[PDB]
Design a binder for this molecule. Structure first.
Ligand SMILES: *[C@@H]1O[C@H](CO)[C@@H](O[C@@H]2O[C@H](CO)[C@@H](O[C@@H]3O[C@H](CO[C@H]4O[C@H](CO)[C@@H](O)[C@H](O)[C@@H]4O)[C@@H](O)[C@H](O[C@H]4O[C@H](CO)[C@@H](O)[C@H](O)[C@@H]4O)[C@@H]3O)[C@H](O)[C@H]2NC(C)=O)[C@H](O)[C@H]1NC(C)=O
Ligand SMILES: *[C@@H]1O[C@H](CO[C@@H]2O[C@@H](C)[C@@H](O)[C@@H](O)[C@@H]2O)[C@@H](O[C@@H]2O[C@H](CO)[C@@H](O[C@@H]3O[C@H](CO)[C@@H](O)[C@H](O)[C@@H]3O)[C@H](O)[C@H]2NC(C)=O)[C@H](O)[C@H]1NC(C)=O
Ligand SMILES: *[C@@H]1O[C@H](CO[C@@H]2O[C@@H](C)[C@@H](O)[C@@H](O)[C@@H]2O)[C@@H](O[C@@H]2O[C@H](CO)[C@@H](O[C@@H]3O[C@H](CO)[C@@H](O)[C@H](O)[C@@H]3O)[C@H](O)[C@H]2NC(C)=O)[C@H](O)[C@H]1NC(C)=O
Ligand SMILES: *[C@@H]1O[C@H](CO[C@@H]2O[C@@H](C)[C@@H](O)[C@@H](O)[C@@H]2O)[C@@H](O[C@@H]2O[C@H](CO)[C@@H](O[C@@H]3O[C@H](CO)[C@@H](O)[C@H](O)[C@@H]3O)[C@H](O)[C@H]2NC(C)=O)[C@H](O)[C@H]1NC(C)=O
Ligand SMILES: *[C@@H]1O[C@H](CO)[C@@H](O[C@@H]2O[C@H](CO)[C@@H](O[C@@H]3O[C@H](CO)[C@@H](O)[C@H](O)[C@@H]3O)[C@H](O)[C@H]2NC(C)=O)[C@H](O)[C@H]1NC(C)=O
Ligand SMILES: *[C@@H]1O[C@H](CO)[C@@H](O[C@@H]2O[C@H](CO)[C@@H](O[C@@H]3O[C@H](CO)[C@@H](O)[C@H](O)[C@@H]3O)[C@H](O)[C@H]2NC(C)=O)[C@H](O)[C@H]1NC(C)=O
Ligand SMILES: *[C@@H]1O[C@H](CO)[C@@H](O[C@@H]2O[C@H](CO)[C@@H](O[C@@H]3O[C@H](CO)[C@@H](O)[C@H](O)[C@@H]3O)[C@H](O)[C@H]2NC(C)=O)[C@H](O)[C@H]1NC(C)=O
Ligand SMILES: *[C@@H]1O[C@H](CO)[C@@H](O[C@@H]2O[C@H](CO)[C@@H](O[C@@H]3O[C@H](CO)[C@@H](O)[C@H](O)[C@@H]3O)[C@H](O)[C@H]2NC(C)=O)[C@H](O)[C@H]1NC(C)=O
Ligand SMILES: *[C@@H]1O[C@H](CO)[C@@H](O[C@@H]2O[C@H](CO)[C@@H](O[C@@H]3O[C@H](CO)[C@@H](O)[C@H](O)[C@@H]3O)[C@H](O)[C@H]2NC(C)=O)[C@H](O)[C@H]1NC(C)=O
Ligand SMILES: *[C@@H]1O[C@H](CO)[C@@H](O[C@@H]2O[C@H](CO)[C@@H](O[C@@H]3O[C@H](CO)[C@@H](O)[C@H](O)[C@@H]3O)[C@H](O)[C@H]2NC(C)=O)[C@H](O)[C@H]1NC(C)=O
Ligand SMILES: *[C@@H]1O[C@H](CO)[C@@H](O[C@@H]2O[C@H](CO)[C@@H](O)[C@H](O)[C@H]2NC(C)=O)[C@H](O)[C@H]1NC(C)=O
Ligand SMILES: *[C@@H]1O[C@H](CO)[C@@H](O[C@@H]2O[C@H](CO)[C@@H](O)[C@H](O)[C@H]2NC(C)=O)[C@H](O)[C@H]1NC(C)=O
Ligand SMILES: *[C@@H]1O[C@H](CO)[C@@H](O[C@@H]2O[C@H](CO)[C@@H](O)[C@H](O)[C@H]2NC(C)=O)[C@H](O)[C@H]1NC(C)=O
Ligand SMILES: *[C@@H]1O[C@H](CO)[C@@H](O[C@@H]2O[C@H](CO)[C@@H](O)[C@H](O)[C@H]2NC(C)=O)[C@H](O)[C@H]1NC(C)=O
Ligand SMILES: *[C@@H]1O[C@H](CO)[C@@H](O)[C@H](O)[C@H]1NC(C)=O
Ligand SMILES: *[C@@H]1O[C@H](CO)[C@@H](O)[C@H](O)[C@H]1NC(C)=O
Ligand SMILES: *[C@@H]1O[C@H](CO)[C@@H](O)[C@H](O)[C@H]1NC(C)=O
Ligand SMILES: *[C@@H]1O[C@H](CO)[C@@H](O)[C@H](O)[C@H]1NC(C)=O
Lengths: 360, 155, 155, 155, 46
């Protein structure tokens, strides 16, 4: 036998997409509520979705993984609020809120579960507005605009790397500056994870009541743009939220903030109600795919391993977050030795002359 | 760089999953070139059967950085393939006349390369490509060997 | 992707207009490969004689989406041509060893493909390319036929 | 389009500087093909040994115009190389069957082309490539000459 | 470029050049394949 080096331009292999890659395209099927790119078509091979595979690959830079496991970014609900000033003594604002599955910031357990913040590598861009716009227009239409927050939220800080996000995160809070010692300083999230899962036809109501007016911050209808800053510096990835947002329905809320009097003191109530949910679909296109299952990442050996993962193209609300998602792409050409039973030949010219002599 | 392939026998998912079983043996030891041929056969067919770029999806692309980097890799791969010397009997992939040593390239390095690693224990592609280039000259391989000429010249 | 060709025998306008008369017969029935060769001769010559990209026009381009899409189609076309098996006697264009059936591909489908259509009555190139790929292997066509071997060993 | 080449025998600086001494003779008169082969040997080896695009440097590129223009030149060159007819014994570069005249192309024009000029006294590449294209057809060059056929048919 | 640079010198920006065309001399006529060369070797070994 004779073993030679061979080059295979198109092997049936895959490699993980890492945080050092530039952003890829994720297509959603509904342009009313989510920005582009848009594709409403079903996957080209619907009968191939969910084919099982065992994977044991390496990487050079940290892979992009979503879910609840070491090395993967945790999903959680994010809220975006539109505030319309109201010229009235009873009602001060009207609200339009959107809730969807997004990326989860790390929690400051030292404080009252605030977000861990960072100020490193601030990007150029339009700052987030510190004041409510006075000219509302098209309240029925949601306008998404990129916005740079005052501080970045930390999504991950461990041996798998440091991931930070400069997009704003919105919550309800009280100013508390220049106030008496009864002003609470805790942040409040208006919607939680169960608001997207437990019921969909049932009406949802949220009521927030306090002695101080409710403020929304940080303002801005902006989506996450995470990036790695340690141990390597990579570009922002504004498409990862598109994968998580399709894993659940998005909830649309409406409501107002009103002023009344309780115990002879001003009282502020925020009411939010919802009876509308929208189902979405997010897909990637070849040569990109998604690996869904019990994905294990070992940073000491730089190995990605999974048993009985499924290969997918699209994420919808049937997705179960007991699994993780790994982004992969078809691999480039590879080199491998292979053996032959005869020596290497350039042409069959000598071979052709053999059958001529035997033909005679 | 983006295609919608409705009328193909196998998509990307089926190609990847079906070949993974034979990929286990490919990671363990040297296989015959017929084994390698059958393993990459469907992948090569799929990447030779796309018709045109999906214009509905392509015109929506905003950041071109990932597409240009992908195209640069494919262009570089095609330039290197045009220069390779390959055995006549296999056309799906290229078998070069460079003999595998196994005293310079142990199998652990090859297995690491097959997994997509780039550490210092992995096979060095740039060093290998230089050896293959200065051994596959047309004036050393195109003319058949001395024994081959005398083997058929009996009659 | 942007060239200024002053010192060429024919420009793009002359190539397109002069070949349109012979393109009428090409749309109606199967022609001989010599007829096809004479029809595409000047177009192939023009697209093989550009010297360099006109830098005066190239450095002004603002939106790169169309240029990158055009280059992706060109790159994909070159990759597919590298694996095509072609008759030795024609080098301007590639004649494959795949036999035209006319019971699978009626001429109406071919005529629609020649007009630039993509409806469901048009020739399916992805399906056709898969058939050509699976029938043009080097181990099926490089060795001449049995009758050809016996047809020359007379002397 | 961007590579980090650590494990190569020679870098771009060494390739350029070492070849400049032989480039003096190349600018003065016609050299043999073995002289030309030795002059470009290391440059060809270097540009066939890069492994992959350096992602650390590639993801930082902001203006893509220069990269896309460079890639367009490379794609155009590869398309033209696929159409060329080359002598079998040299594979590093392509020797065409077009005979140098020296009554149509004086050496001063060739020397100006080697220096990277594009004035009206320089070799016209587009005109030359048309001449080479319509003289390198497979039906005029693939079959050996009459004298060659009669030369070997003595025995 | 670093701080050891001396500004009595000038800096010119250059790039590796694209393909070039050059006349080239051979000792025998142009051939497409070694097929005749192979047949000569067979007849000389008999
Ligand atoms: C983007 O992509 C997403 C993901 O695919 C699409 O989301 C789907 O949206 C459709 C339409 O809105 C949803 O279908 C709805 O489901 C409900 C009932 O279906 C359940 O019950 C039946 C009964 O057995 C089962 O067969 C079925 O599997 C479900 O379990 C109802 O809300 C709707 O019923 C409507 O149609 C029927 C007629 O069939 C009427 O009887 C009803 O009165 C009513 O009119 C409807 O069928 C579907 O569930 C969503 N898929 C998910 C969540 O995975 C988005 O629509 C799409 N967006 C676009 C294209 O803009
Ligand atoms: C298969 O590979 C072996 C081993 O290759 C060695 O290890 C690799 C990882 C690379 O680093 C190689 O460069 C390295 O050689 C080859 O055997 C080796 O051959 C060389 C050259 O003959 C030997 O070098 C000798 O060293 C001294 C001077 O330094 C003198 O004895 C000789 O002049 C000679 O240069 C080297 O010792 C030898 N290594 C071993 C372990 O035997 C081997 O040639 C190759 N097989 C082939 C090409 O068929
Ligand atoms: C030229 O093409 C014809 C017709 O091709 C038919 O129509 C095309 C548009 C495509 O859809 C083709 O897939 C389709 O076949 C070929 O003739 C066909 O051959 C097949 C295979 O022998 C016949 O199928 C048979 O069907 C049944 C079982 O379903 C059994 O009799 C046989 O086992 C066999 O599978 C098919 O009937 C037949 N069609 C006609 C109209 O005769 C033809 O082979 C091809 N010519 C070649 C390859 O030289
Ligand atoms: C080598 O090149 C010479 C000279 O080429 C001339 O100059 C170049 C810069 C280009 O502009 C060429 O187009 C140009 O011809 C070739 O010799 C030339 O051959 C042509 C064709 O036979 C001669 O033209 C003749 O002119 C009149 C009519 O105008 C009649 O006598 C003939 O019918 C013929 O067309 C031309 O005079 C002649 N020039 C010289 C200086 O001799 C030469 O053929 C070529 N060598 C080859 C191809 O082997
Ligand atoms: C590459 O794709 C080809 C198809 O283009 C795959 O070959 C196919 O494999 C299946 C599964 O083994 C074969 O089906 C078999 O048929 C009979 C019963 O009908 C029996 O032998 C088995 O039980 C099985 O069902 C099918 O015939 C075969 N098709 C062919 C050879 O044309 C192949 O598996 C793919 N390979 C890789 C590595 O992806
Ligand atoms: C070029 O490659 C082709 C395709 O691989 C080679 O043809 C193959 O030849 C082998 C060796 O004879 C065949 O294997 C044997 O075939 C039969 C099957 O009944 C049997 O004798 C043995 O069990 C063994 O499997 C193989 O079938 C055949 N493949 C095809 C597709 O025809 C060919 O030999 C190569 N040419 C060379 C190396 O010059
Ligand atoms: C492709 O371009 C070639 C030229 O490169 C075109 O061929 C040219 O065609 C014209 C018109 O038929 C020929 O002129 C004819 O010449 C003689 C007299 O010399 C006579 O037959 C006619 O009176 C007419 O004038 C010209 O010679 C010929 N040039 C050649 C062969 O070099 C061709 O038409 C173009 N084809 C297409 C499909 O675009
Ligand atoms: C490879 O292609 C070349 C170029 O097309 C073929 O040469 C052509 O051969 C045909 C058949 O002999 C010639 O047609 C005949 O030419 C003369 C014209 O006076 C005459 O005998 C007949 O009326 C007929 O038309 C044709 O001229 C010739 N073309 C050229 C440019 O030389 C060659 O046969 C092909 N080789 C193969 C298929 O093996
Ligand atoms: C292209 O690169 C090759 C190396 O890959 C260069 O060839 C090398 O040239 C040097 C300098 O002439 C040779 O060194 C010589 O070695 C002995 C020492 O006793 C002696 O002959 C000389 O004094 C000199 O030092 C070296 O052997 C040679 N390497 C080879 C042939 O493998 C070549 O110069 C480069 N050419 C260009 C045009 O860049
Ligand atoms: C294809 O190209 C190769 C490589 O250039 C040619 O081989 C070369 O053949 C020439 C002519 O015989 C050799 O030059 C002579 O070699 C010895 C050196 O001691 C001596 O007789 C003379 O001083 C002269 O230099 C040359 O060494 C040889 N090169 C190699 C690397 O083997 C071959 O002839 C070409 N085949 C053709 C044109 O059919
Ligand atoms: C992935 O690996 C698992 C575990 O090795 C495989 O599961 C085994 O499948 C075989 C048959 O293929 C059964 O006999 C075993 O009982 C299974 N479990 C084991 C060994 O623990 C699985 O088949 C592999 N391949 C996939 C999912 O494609
Ligand atoms: C809370 O309200 C105050 C006004 O009472 C806002 O303005 C700040 O006022 C304090 C106290 O005078 C100053 O130190 C700050 O510099 C003021 N900020 C600005 C931007 O002028 C304050 O911004 C409000 N805080 C929040 C978080 O909304
Ligand atoms: C602010 O929002 C609340 C909650 O949606 C409004 O109260 C609703 O009023 C409507 C219209 O009469 C009733 O159908 C609902 O039953 C009420 N909901 C609740 C929870 O009481 C309230 O009217 C709004 N205030 C404004 C617009 O000033
Ligand atoms: C929240 O509740 C309000 C009413 O309190 C809803 O607004 C009404 O919606 C119904 C049903 O579509 C309309 O007929 C009424 O005209 C709306 N206005 C009033 C004043 O009743 C509102 O749709 C609810 N919000 C969400 C997101 O479901
Ligand atoms: C070649 O054959 C030997 C002896 O049987 C075997 O050990 C070796 O692995 C074979 N080489 C391959 C399969 O590359
Ligand atoms: C690879 O690099 C590491 C760096 O820590 C080193 O410890 C190891 O020995 C190296 N392995 C080699 C050169 O084979
Ligand atoms: C093509 O699609 C149209 C859709 O209206 C359908 O009517 C027609 O029958 C189709 N033709 C085919 C499948 O040949
Ligand atoms: C080149 O152009 C210049 C323009 O000034 C002209 O003087 C010169 O004669 C030209 N040379 C040619 C056409 O050979």
């Amino acid at each position: 036998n004779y073993t030679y080096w061979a080059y295979v331009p198109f092997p049936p292999l895959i490699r993980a997409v890492t945080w050092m890659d530039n952003p890829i395209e994720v297509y959603v099927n509904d342009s009313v509520w989510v920005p582009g790119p848009i594709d409403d078509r079903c996957p080209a091979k619907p009968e191939e979705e969910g084919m099982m595979i065992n994977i044991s690959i390496g990487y050079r830079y940290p892979p992009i993984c979503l879910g609840r496991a070491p090395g993967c970014l945790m999903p959680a609900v994010q809220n975006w609020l539109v505030e319309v000033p109201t010229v009235s003594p009873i009602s001060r604002f009207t609200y339009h809120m959107v809730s969807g599955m997004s990326l989860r910031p790390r929690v400051n357990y030292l404080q009252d579960f605030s977000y861990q913040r960072s100020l490193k590598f601030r990007p150029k861009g339009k700052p987030c507005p510190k004041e409510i716009p006075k000219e509302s227009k098209n309240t029925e239409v949601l306008v998404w605009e990129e916005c740079v927050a005052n501080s970045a939220v930390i999504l991950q800080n461990n041996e798998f790397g440091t991931i930070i996000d400069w997009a704003p995160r919105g919550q309800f809070y009280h100013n508390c500056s220049g106030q008496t010692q009864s002003c609470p300083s805790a942040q409040v999230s208006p919607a939680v994870d169960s608001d997207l899962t437990e019921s969909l036809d049932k009406h949802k109501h949220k009521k927030l009541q306090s002695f101080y007016p409710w403020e929304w911050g940080e303002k801005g209808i902006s989506t996450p743009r995470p990036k790695i800053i340690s141990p390597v510096s990579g570009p922002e990835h504004p498409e990862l939220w598109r994968l998580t947002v399709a894993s659940h329905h998005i909830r649309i809320w409406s409501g107002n903030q009103t002023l009344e009097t309780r115990d002879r003191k001003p009282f502020y109530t925020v009411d939010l109600n919802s009876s509308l949910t929208v189902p979405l679909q997010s897909c990637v296109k070849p040569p990109y795919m998604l690996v869904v299952g019990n994905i294990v990442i070992k940073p000491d050996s730089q190995t990605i391993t999974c048993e009985n993962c499924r290969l997918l193209t699209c994420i919808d609300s049937t997705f179960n977050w007991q699994h993780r998602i790994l982004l992969v792409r078809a691999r480039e050409g590879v080199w491998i030795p292979c053996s032959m039973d005869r020596p290497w030949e350039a042409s069959p010219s000598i071979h052709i002359l053999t059958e001529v002599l035997k033909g005679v | 760089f983006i295609f919608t392939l409705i009328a193909v026998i196998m998509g990307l998912i089926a190609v990847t999953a079906t070949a993974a079983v034979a990929g286990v043996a490919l990671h363990s030891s040297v296989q015959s070139c017929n084994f390698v041929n059958d393993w990459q056969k469907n992948s090569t067919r799929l990447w030779n059967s796309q018709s045109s770029i999906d214009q509905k999806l392509a015109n929506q692309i905003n950041d071109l950085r990932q597409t240009v980097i992908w195209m640069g890799d494919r262009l570089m791969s095609l330039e290197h393939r045009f220069q390779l010397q390959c055995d006549w009997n296999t056309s799906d992939f290229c078998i070069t006349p460079q003999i595998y040593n196994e005293s310079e390239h142990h199998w652990d390095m090859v297995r690491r390369h097959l997994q997509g690693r780039e550490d210092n224990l992995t096979l060095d592609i740039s060093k290998l490509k230089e050896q293959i280039f200065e051994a596959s000259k047309a004036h050393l391989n195109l003319v058949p060997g001395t024994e081959a000429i005398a083997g058929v010249a009996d009659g």
